[PDB]
Amino acid sequence: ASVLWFQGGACSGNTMSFLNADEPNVVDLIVDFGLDLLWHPSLGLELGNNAQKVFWDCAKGERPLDIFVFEGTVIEAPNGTGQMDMFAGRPMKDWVTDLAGAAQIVVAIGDCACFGGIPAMEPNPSGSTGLQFHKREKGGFLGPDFRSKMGLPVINVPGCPAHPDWITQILVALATGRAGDITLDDLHRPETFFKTFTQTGCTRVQFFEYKQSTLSFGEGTRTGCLFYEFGCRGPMTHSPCNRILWNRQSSKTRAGMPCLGCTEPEFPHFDLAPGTVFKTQKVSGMIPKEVPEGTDHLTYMGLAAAARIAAPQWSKEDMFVV
């Protein structure tokens, strides 16, 4: 299975995260799983005209392209020319057009590629967009009706960056005959990773249940949930970040950092407008503006009051102790 991994408006974080892959690690994925990595800007040996030969052979159908991985945004500025992202003699968006049209499967890795991500933040100088989404709005660069040659839409492996497993396990599934096991949600994300929430497996959910808030960073995060004071988007964000830990160690929320909802197409949420960074926007100083997914402010708040009154003592003390 040939893989061509291109980077548009990328920071290469998805590649670096991918390189952190374990079980399989990246080398075993590239070699031992029958995935022929044709080229990758961070890893491909070919430069210049040899690399362009590889790209053109993929684009024109001279050689098969099974998986086109795209990382980074599709940069369309200036004026829709895409010349703020010139790659191998073309605007990167033209490469995207050709290769997405050539690939059996197109995988957008990372929010930039999936939805536009950080570069698509206003004022979006690069005219960045995702492959098939611009933020939540379906269509992105390739249009809502784009399908790869295997009939799939762009497989969106979101995250900023995506966790290595979010792509590697998909690649293994494709390589092991389990492509049919891959189900995609409405954002084209693999449901095997994105039916759960970041909160799922968060070490602070018991504090969340009892509405015990982390009050401060550092040692303050030895207790409490980050939802109330730090804008944790865990309960509104689909991800397996607390199921499949980052770097096989931790997750933002475990570590005391609020989930920024990076697997969600709106990321960065509120465009990091003043007062929204590591803060919970609240109505009347008590009611979070955004409640967990599938809840309503009145039942949430009622249950929150009930949970506060019935809170056990341990939920009000440090638990992640030295």
Partner 1 sequence: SPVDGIRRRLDDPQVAEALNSLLDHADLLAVLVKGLDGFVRRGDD
Annotated binding site for [3Fe-4S] cluster: 241, 259, 262
Closest CA to 265 of 89, 131, 64, 163: 131
Q: Which listed residue (2, 4, 14, 29) binds ligand F3S by CB under 6 A?
A: 14
Whose Cβ is closer to ligand F3S: residue 13's or residue 127's? 13
Residue 205, binding choice from partner 1, ligand F3S, none, Cβ under 5 to 8 Å by partner class: ligand F3S
Among 24, 110, 231, 288, binds ligand F3S (CB under 6 A): 110
- Asked if residue 208 binds ligand F3S (CB under 6 A), the reply is yes
Tell the smallest beta-carbon distance from residue 126 to partner 1 (Å).
55
The correct pick among 234, 265, 268, 288 for binding ligand F3S (CB under 6 A) is: 234
Binding site partner of 288, from ligand F3S, partner 1, none, Cβ cut-off 5-8 A by kind: none
**Residue labelled with tokens 């784009």:** 146
Q: Judged by CB under 6 A, does residue 72 bind ligand F3S?
A: yes
111 binds, among ligand F3S, partner 1, none (CB under 5 to 8 A by kind): ligand F3S
- Rg, C-alpha atoms of the chain: 21
Q: Which does 312 bind (CB under 5 to 8 A by kind): ligand F3S, partner 1, none?
A: partner 1
Residues 167-206 touching ligand F3S, rule: CB under 6 A, are: 198-199, 202, 204-205
Separation CA 189–CA 219 (nearest Å):
35
The least distance separating ligand F3S from the CB of residue 198, rounded to whole angstroms, comes to 4
- Is residue 117 part of the contact set for ligand F3S (CB under 6 A)? yes
First to last CA, the chain: 47
Nearer to partner 1, 191 or 317 (CB): 317
Q: Provide, rounded to whole angstroms, the least separation between the CB of residue 242 and ligand F3S.
A: 7
Q: Is 250 exposed, middle or buried (0-12, 13-18, 19+ CB in 10 A)?
A: middle
Binding site for partner 1 (CB under 8 A): 311-313
Binder to ligand F3S among 65, 152, 225, 304 (CB under 6 A)? Answer: 225
Residue with tokens 């939920």: 315
CA distances from 76 to 83, 92, 143 (A): 7, 9, 14
Stretch that binds ligand F3S, among 10-18, 49-57, 94-102, 143-151 (CB under 6 A): 10-18
Query: Which of partner 1, ligand F3S, none does residue 165 bind (CB under 5 to 8 Å by kind)?
Result: none
DSSP-assigned beta bridge partners for residue 4: 39, 68
From the annotation, which residues make up the binding site for [4Fe-4S] cluster? 11, 112, 160, 202, 225, 232
The size of the interface with ligand F3S (CB under 6 A), counted in residues, is 37
Which residues contact ligand F3S by CB under 6 A?
10-11, 13-14, 71-72, 110-112, 117-118, 159-161, 198-199, 202, 204-205, 208, 225-227, 232, 234-235, 237, 239, 241, 251-253, 259-263
